[PDB]
Design a protein around this ligand. Structure first.
Ligand SMILES: CC(C)(COP(=O)(O)OP(=O)(O)OC[C@H]1O[C@@H](n2cnc3c(N)ncnc32)[C@H](O)[C@@H]1OP(=O)(O)O)[C@@H](O)C(=O)NCCC(=O)NCC[C@H](F)C(=O)O
Ligand SMILES: CC(C)(COP(=O)(O)OP(=O)(O)OC[C@H]1O[C@@H](n2cnc3c(N)ncnc32)[C@H](O)[C@@H]1OP(=O)(O)O)[C@@H](O)C(=O)NCCC(=O)NCC[C@H](F)C(=O)O
Ligand SMILES: O=C([O-])CC(=O)C(=O)O
Ligand SMILES: O=C([O-])CC(=O)C(=O)O
Lengths: 435, 435
């Protein structure tokens, strides 16, 4: 009865037409200019790509197919007796642009439970990895190794006509989303619960619930946290490092496993998703140097020392957001409801009152407000997940939802190879005169 | 006596100053405009990044720090009794912008022989990989796994001041270039020469020679081919998929191993470096369907069938080049000198006379000329390297030279996070009115 793939078959041709006519009329219309500073500045401010699933507003934050987080919290189906949106529903919304029914949501859940299975070669590799190999590197290498199962890679090799690329990307997308939690849980168990097993998938539970059972957590509030976590970290428009990386690699026709693994190596950078781990390590040294209940003057001193040492304060600032990240606010609200007296939470709350002021004083950051990473690990630690080097993996698992949803669309719409022109400083000086 | 790292310490501050003043005067100067079609078109034609090591001219082809291939062939040091440039010398040129002395070239060779050593966990993983896991995926997963040895990742974790990032990237760069051949050779042996060993590095030979000995080839002309291959596939400006991917991932502060592995997943796409493999598989089906000596009318029929089936003709076309790739010409010249009567070479020669005409007739490709991938595998096969699924790995090994040379510069110059703005089709229609 429900079949996302049939839904997409009807949607595709209409969007193709719509874009075709638009470009007929406005393809040559200019939407912006490029300056020397934008080239030197990591394209800051350049409108450079088309990404359909989500769009970020610098002041208001992210919108998923038009809906803000509060709107999704309210509109998306929840688990029986739950309060947090199921990420399965967020995936349907991103892919079709429509709010799904609970019936449609449970179909996603069953499809993902049905497709979760790991090949033995991947299992062996994980089991043979050393404990000092970072969890994100373990994750990226296992996803890369899963490419032997690519249905897209296989069809490509068989000579499939380019109009059908999307059909195979969709299959690999749903299979990869299905498998992610098993891969991530195996790493968690191997590194931190040596000698135990992730167990089996219960075709009757939602994806987050099977995931938390494989991680070994029993707390029902923890399952709720996971549902929220996985929904909010899902997508953040196209220009963020991880999504842009999957887009660019996928543009060369690399399969979704290869495209997502490359995205993960970008999410592991300290300036991107690894900041969620970095924030906890910074907080831990904080409480260690200053000891648990610190005065504001001491917290200020501590922030200054980081700044003065040529380092960034993790969890603050953004390439596009100009105000407090709504994903940060959504997390604060969850804390206030569930762990209002936690001391670390209290520390995170206190820093909100101080860091922005110090960053403003310093005068270098354009956005002195916190980002999503400043409040995520605090929530995790409270429920017993204290392994901070593992935090980015959860972000990686959520990120698959958005990037894979767009990936299907990129191929459905025929987007070509991402290939801009580069310039040397010498060549650019000549182009203008020099300076 | 020779120490590239000391050379770079003098160069860095001067380039920093030069760029600083230039941007003081022209940062706001506009170098171009962005149109709707460029956004939908994978940024085609957009000047979007600064990349110092090489610059591609659409008509003339690539220049490495100002020198064309014929110029490098002529200026770069060669092996004793050799004719082809040593890739070690090309690396010095890319990194310093100056033609090195043979003395300087041998220092690179010894440094790379000194740093080649693989950790056991990487050795075990390779040895446990199944034979149906593509060589590029085996390569990318092993590079990812090597990140546990990252000196940059380590310094970052220790809180190093950002001004010293380049020093650690340089170390990881030289270590990674050193190790590449051992990793690539282990894959070659495991897959195609099961039960044999790559052997050991001879500190007295050039990098290409140790590499060919580890692959198990004895032919001296083959060593010469390798030197040329590795030099020409080294860099191709910054906007190509592989280089842009390393740039973008590295921009997040991910270590060079993570940045290069993500680059490799982009090089494995069929529209990028995997085309070198694709060309041989297409040629093999050709000679199989039509049988060895084909008439031009039959070759035309065969090209048309590919085009009509919704597929690309591998090895032809380019995102930027508008004329025959000089890397193709450089390869043709090598063939004419060394294997002029090879039947496959003859087929490749014959297609040069036909494919461009058919592509022009079809009217879709902007560049109907051949690219580097159309002539590389032909050379390999002639010397006995007939394992076509392994071809892209050699391109991967060469590519490390250019991307890693720029990576050091990106960090030395303080380039920030690559983060452009994305737009949805709906949001863009509104920005203009719609269509
Ligand atoms: C997010 C990030 C990379 C944005 O970079 P960018 O758009 O270049 O920032 P700005 O334009 O504000 O940078 C202007 C200057 O302020 C500095 N600055 C910005 N944010 C800073 C911070 N948190 N701490 C210290 N200095 C900071 C910049 O490093 C830059 O200094 P420079 O001129 O000497 O290079 C930057 O704010 C940062 O480093 N933040 C800390 C790391 C972080 O939290 N990353 C996670 C963010 C996100 F949520 C994600 O998970 O992806
Ligand atoms: C190189 C590549 C991706 C450039 O793409 P792009 O800049 O988008 O090409 P164009 O602007 O010329 O594309 C215009 C149209 O011509 C088609 N076309 C271009 N080259 C073609 C080819 N070799 N065979 C068939 N159709 C081709 C394009 O696919 C596109 O059709 P579409 O409108 O229906 O999408 C394209 O030429 C191609 O697919 N070539 C074949 C694959 C290949 O050889 N890759 C290796 C190239 C390089 F050397 C490398 O190794 O990285
Ligand atoms: O938007 C960005 O650049 C980074 C970010 O917050 C995300 O990827 O979630
Ligand atoms: O220049 C490009 O876009 C691709 C290419 O030829 C290379 O990366 O060598």
């Amino acid at each position: 009865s429900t079949n996302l793939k049939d839904v997409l078959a009807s949607l595709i041709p209409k969007e193709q037409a719509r874009i075709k006519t638009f470009r007929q009329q406005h393809g040559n219309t200019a939407v912006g200019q490029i300056t020397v500073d934008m080239s030197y500045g990591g394209m800051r401010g350049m409108k450079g790509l088309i990404y359909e699933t989500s769009v970020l507003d610098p002041d208001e934050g992210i919108r998923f197919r038009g809906f803000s987080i509060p709107e999704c919290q309210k509109l998306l189906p929840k688990a029986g007796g739950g309060e947090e949106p199921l990420p399965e529903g967020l995936f349907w919304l991103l892919v079709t642009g429509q709010i799904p029914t609970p019936e449609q949501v449970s179909w996603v859940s069953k499809e993902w439970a049905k497709r979760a299975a790991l090949p033995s070669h991947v299992v062996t590799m994980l089991d043979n990895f050393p404990t000092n190999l970072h969890p994100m590197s373990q994750l990226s290498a296992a996803i890369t190794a899963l490419n032997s199962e690519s249905n897209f890679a296989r069809a490509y090799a068989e000579g499939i006509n380019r109009t059908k690329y999307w059909e195979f990307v969709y299959e690999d997308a749903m299979d990869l989303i299905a498998k992610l939690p098993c891969v991530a849980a195996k790493i968690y168990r191997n590194l931190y619960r040596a000698g135990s097993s992730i167990g089996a998938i219960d075709s009757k539970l939602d994806w987050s619930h099977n995931f938390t059972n494989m991680l070994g957590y029993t707390d029902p509030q923890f399952t709720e946290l996971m549902r929220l976590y996985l929904t909010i970290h899902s997508d953040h428009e196209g220009g963020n490092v991880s999504a842009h990386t999957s887009h660019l690699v996928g543009s060369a026709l690399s399969d979704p496993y290869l495209s997502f693994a490359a995205a993960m190596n970008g999410l592991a950078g300290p300036l991107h998703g690894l900041a969620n781990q970095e924030v906890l390590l910074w907080l831990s040294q904080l409480q260690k140097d200053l000891g648990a209940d610190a005065s504001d003057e001491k917290l200020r001193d501590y922030i200054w020392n980081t700044l003065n040492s040529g380092r960034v304060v993790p969890g603050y600032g953004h390439a596009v957001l100009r105000k407090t990240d709504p994903r940060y606010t959504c997390q604060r609200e969850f804390a206030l409801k569930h762990l209002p007296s936690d001391p670390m939470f209290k520390l995170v709350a206190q820093l909100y009152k101080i860091v922005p002021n110090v960053l403003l004083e310093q005068g270098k950051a354009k956005n002195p407000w916190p980002n999503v990473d400043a409040h995520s690990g605090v929530l995790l630690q409270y429920y017993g997940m204290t392994e901070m080097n593992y935090y980015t993996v959860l972000f990686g698992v959520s990120r698959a939802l958005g990037v894979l949803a767009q990936l299907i669309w990129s191929r459905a719409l025929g987007f070509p190879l991402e290939r801009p022109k580069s310039m040397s400083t010498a060549g650019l000086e000549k182009l203008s005169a020099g300076g």
